[model samples]
Target: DREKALELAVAQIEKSYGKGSVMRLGDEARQPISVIPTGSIALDVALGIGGLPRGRVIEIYGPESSGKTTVALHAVANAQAAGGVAAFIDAEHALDPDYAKKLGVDTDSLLVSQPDTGEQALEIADMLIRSGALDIVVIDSVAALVPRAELEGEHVGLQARLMSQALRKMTGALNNSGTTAIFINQLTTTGGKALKFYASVRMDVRRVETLKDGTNAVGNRTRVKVVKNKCSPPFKQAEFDILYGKGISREGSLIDMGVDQGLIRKSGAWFTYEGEQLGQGKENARNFLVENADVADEIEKKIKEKLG
Candidate 1:
């Protein structure tokens, strides 16, 4: 009876739409989910599938200065790089165009919004998704969105509840609109438990270590741990460095990763891999990998094996 019901459903869809429009069981599965790169090799590898999947709700939650905004903006940059429109729903009023541009986000094409309350923010996001124009949308820090009642000094503990409802209502729109929705949130003792329930992917970002140039703190490395992932395996982790002025250390980190993992060898200032000399220093190592496709592929494979 179930098999017959499935057949009838497929027939109905096919008849209403077109032939072969309905997917069947074991039908060489097509990838309905599209992914936008996070703009960092190690971060992408840590994500396991190399990017943020479209048509899904992704939550990036962590304490302050954990590079959450950096990661989110990088995804926006990647979406714009692919000729897709992007938007930033700045509920926290912390959006910095200068910093976002430095991260490669096309400020001219990005639509920025400031909603005073959680309900209004959700309404705006739903409107944007329904517009069928934007490819990705980011809501900066859910904690910053105050509930109307709370703003009126009558807090009844409905902030998270209202947020949950908004996200639940927008889930269908997110799927049908073909938009990648990313919500940046803050972590407390409960750790974003309410919102995480609805998110398809949830990552907890944390500071790993700091990088220094002599006595000055130049940059810091952070780790993104996949707390939940419906598209791939959960609990996967990735680390990437962020410099003060240079943005994510994507290329230099690749070189360091190769050397650290023994994928590339070094001897007296020379770095070599598979009998091909990569270069003498870090700069040359990065340049060699950037120029040599095959060598870069090999390095990527090794990195994936170690991190992915």
Candidate 2:
């Protein structure tokens, strides 16, 4: 939505302090932001429609190394394993290849770009979104970009101006697209004002110190805050962990979906799989799917169908 957000910004440089629903209150029905789950563990339906939006922009921001980039891998893996395409524009150039491997992302063919002009990067990001070939594309930390306008000289206003121009342009093109744009700028405010308005959903993540291992400290855990949303209510938070030698293990996330959608039914300690037994309790159900990923994949496909 940097496209929508920045395009709005571009007009100011070029033009909605009032922010109209419609000049004539135009016609439409209650539309959905609609369906694209992070599909990794906890983020499935917590946001909206049991997933994020396919054609909208989403921003996840927070402190350094809160495992913010890890989820981007989740997105790519979700896309690639499903045979859908994915791309990444790493402004930081600090992507850990091992991370992607851990997440099961296919790095050998992943579309990776590590540099840009704020405008150039904006244009490039625009192209990817507008291309409509990709299922999703991620720009890690939108804060580092330098617009050509500012790159040529000094002042903040003009650079961000052209930057906004590119963003707005990209947004409109991507509006009707299926591609999902992602930005992981450090600090909630680092990426500038464009992202805030452009984003259909915003989440603030932070690494936790208190989240610890049973006997020894190993990996990390992050607190995920759904700061604001256009598709659902805002300010809800969820927490999940990353193992040291491991990555995100989507524990029972889809299981919850199955339960809600009735793919898996639970009464007290026992979980029933449609008609048979899934497990005795929460852990049992997750491990059952964990060891039998084919089963998990089957449930997710059925879940999305239900959502559709």
Candidate 3:
């Protein structure tokens, strides 16, 4: 009799709204929240539970050459690697498939679209999430989003108005799906206010130093800090390298992070990690983890244990 009454209550709610409007507390195996890796060990660790929260809006904003696209794509690759699908709304019109491939994305399978206007981009994003067909979706850059009226002439402050409405709709759409929305925005703007307001997390990326080889610039170290976080502890930071044409460095990224934590010891030019003499230079020290998965896992575990 008690079970029948509970069913009747759920049935009534479903009839009034939708089938998914109600669920018994333990009837569904749903986690309160889930996370996906941002593709950097330090960053994942900075995010508290070692990843970015899924089913929420996240903002990645910074100046040019600050690895905004790199950060977003790394997450995309991780999602795909986990047997999930992803899409990129390249409103900036500059997504390099080769670069994405180099970053370990299944380029052929990634859904990419360069929308003509801001409205179209938002429409595509809305459809992608509403269909519940993707695990992650990234809008290239909010600075690139242009409304129809603005493309033709001046509709001052129109983009923000549109973003306000679209993000509200997309926020609602996220509720019924498992998709994590990542919005890339530039440093300067009024249009970005709505993004910051709606975003569950905001990572502000900045260039720390240039990585050089001879006179040519090969890569640059970047620092990304969580400016706002609702899912975990805020203000955590991660510094890593982004190699031009290659993407975030896998082995080299965590050397300094580990060193700063005192997990990796540095004596003059020599470096040691995980009960082994890695090499003379820091470069060789990082290579040890890259070459040995078993040792890397142990080192990572040690770092995490201390992190807690």
Candidate 4:
């Protein structure tokens, strides 16, 4: 009688909703969530379990020039590479085609939309998510989006309220559509709460060092810290060195991370791995990682052990 009642309950819910809408607890095999990598290995590992999880809202916020857009574009590129469609809703009108091209994003394959207001941007994104055509979507810099009334020079204080409503509605769409959404935001003076509460993952990026080739400044080394992650543990940190001309350095921050964690041994200018000499200093370390397969695997394994 008890089993019959359970079966009847399931039948009723499925009839009202749809088939496969309800599941019992501990149904691990029934759930297969898709993940798209962020293209940066350091970033992928820092994100905890798999790469960016689908059907969730990820908030990436930082100061200007902290690689928030760069990281978001990398996810889009990864999604496209995985044979999935992607969209970038640009409310700030700052989608740089040349920079995106340099980052290995297939600009033609990605749908780029320039919305005039925050409401319009979120509306377009919600439509795209519900259409089921896109696997990933990104909103570039929520700080730049102006409320419709504010743009008309009326009720400037309503910007935050508009943003809160937009994010609330957008989160619902993300949940039902199984689409991975990324919200790029800048550090506000007060640090808004609505997006933070709705976002499944939140990352804070800050510049740690300036990378240089001899006397010329080449790029910035930034620390990407997972401020909050509902999918896994939080407060994890990863460093990435980004070059304006060359994209993310293959070596990036791994070399320093390895040395700091004792995965790779270094003495003065010399570097060694697995009791074998790899190289000397930064350039040689990069060459060692590229040339030695066994050494590279060991280094990666150790880093993953420590970080993950």
Candidate 5:
């Protein structure tokens, strides 16, 4: 049924781009095309029920070392371990083989691009989409390969327009192939813009809920928000303590992995150190405040307590 259509699209792409050219919208499903997993459950909560829809583009924005690479690697490992192959489009020369190995990825199954130009990255991505062999393809940072023409312009609106158009094509191709794509982003504070402007789904990651007492076992934590989703209703962001070494402790990565609504309540025994609850005794210190403002306020309060 759908297999015939998918093969046809692959054939067309091969004819034009040669073997592994590029994929486009309305390709064909009938296959396990791509499946992108957010390293943390909190991040996945931003994706509507169906989880990173098969047909649209999505973004993840955060400061450096704020776990962008960590998350991307984790996603790659997850996909690869799940019996699917993943590709990393290294546009900024940021791919680290050591890090990839540490993340437990099968090097042989991984396809990394050595594109020296943004145009080259696009071409490589196009080929991957057309091949229909990838389960997930990640673009490390779109801005590095793309330009800051509009991002630096006075009005930053639609600066991601062209990039989004390009990503949209990838999204469409993945949807047709029933695959998943992850776009890792570097936070840009230059303008009041976010990386998810053109994605089918957008996720914002920030560090929050730091531990006041250095002695405390748990350290700082993170929260993920789903600002936009094309196929599902907008959702409140999710929260979690993103720790290194330990496996995933939270679940907001998707709608079903959501946490208890009651976790948002303030702890009565608050302020063990730095006016911030250590979140040690609590069943789940990582809270998912549905309202973005409330979540922001909570983080601010935690920071103030820590500083105090």
Candidate 6:
């Protein structure tokens, strides 16, 4: 991550800082990089058992209102909860107060910077780096970022390359100081065309399913599709409920864990993973907990019976 990047950068800087081309290859090397996490346990497990590591640039791209920003904001709350300052760079200036409130964020600890141009955003980011108070820094919506007008078309590719370079530089800078950086991207397609992009990690979320309960809000459908992850292979798709402050409801809940696929299970009873019988599918899995309660059971009873 950033620490490793910085270690290599510092080694190079030290070689030239003194006006000499010096090289040192230690006979015994040591590990330097530290992996950071995003604080969502299931997603973390899906993302190589931790979270997005510090000192790396992660690209998240999806259409507006596709829950891309939702995950991003939750991440900010997570970082701050872990005892560090998290910064959100709003390129669109559309970060809504009510939306942030819904996520239960303590905005006092977050740093929000709005830059009119990508250049200006980079300038602010560099300044934030120098300030040394940032723990997590996020740049929202990279595609809308304005590069020099002259750098258009094929030349714009160079601009993207330059931005990529800047990201690497920022990653190194933050890693050296034990900080985290997340970059958001706006997905664009010309005439339904797709473009391959590069980043340490990229997650492209899209809609996969919707549920209907005669309610417009909670019944809405949303699924997170892992379009690309360079570090590891993940479940390409997963379903989650968008709760207010809870964010994405986990998989393996009652429906996922308890229901035996393609079974008509009964209510007021529990089943083993593979057991299902008599029309219990639509009921909230909670309503079917195994019966025969009201007895103060102890381990000794079962053990004594088995031993006897």
Q: Which candidate number maximizes lDDT?
A: 3
What lDDT would each prediction earn against the true structure?
Answer: 0.78, 0.68, 0.81, 0.76, 0.55, 0.54
Model 5, span 129-246: residue lDDT tens: 7788877778877667654453344344343454545665665576687556777777534221433554656777777765333465553466667666544445457665545543
Better candidate by TM-score, 1 or 3: 3
Please state the error at residue 232 of candidate 6 in Å: 3.8
lDDT of 4 by residue, 164-279 (tens): 77778778778788899998888634325787877878989888998877787788887889887666656777888778765675564557767877877787788876687778
Q: How close is candidate 4 to the true structure, as a TM-score?
A: 0.78
Worst 10 residues of 4 by lDDT: 24-33
Give the TM-scores of the predictions, in the order they appear.
0.79, 0.72, 0.84, 0.78, 0.59, 0.63
Which has the better lDDT: candidate 2, or candidate 3? 3
lDDT of 1: 0.78
Q: Tens digits of per-residue lDDT for model 2 on 1-308?
A: 89898667655653233222222112222335545556453565456356666777888887777777786677778777867788888767788788678778899888887765766666677877767888888887577876665566643455445545666776676668877888877862354677777777788878776334456865676677888765555666666666554666575666665676766778878988767677877657867878887777788777656643
lDDT of 3: 0.81
Tens digits of per-residue lDDT for model 1, 196-233: 77787899999999976568777788888987776665
Model 6 spans with C-alpha error above 4 angstroms: 1-40, 148-158, 188-198, 214-221, 227-237, 244-246, 250-308
Per-residue alpha-carbon lDDT of candidate 6 for residues 113-153, written as tens digits (9 for 90 to 100): 88766677877886787577877788876766676553343
The candidate scoring highest on TM-score is 3
Please, what are the lDDT tens digits per residue for candidate 3 over residues 129-246? 9889899999987888989998887527888888999999899888679799999888626474788878878999999999885587688888999987766657778888888987
**Model 4 pairs whose backbones collide:** none
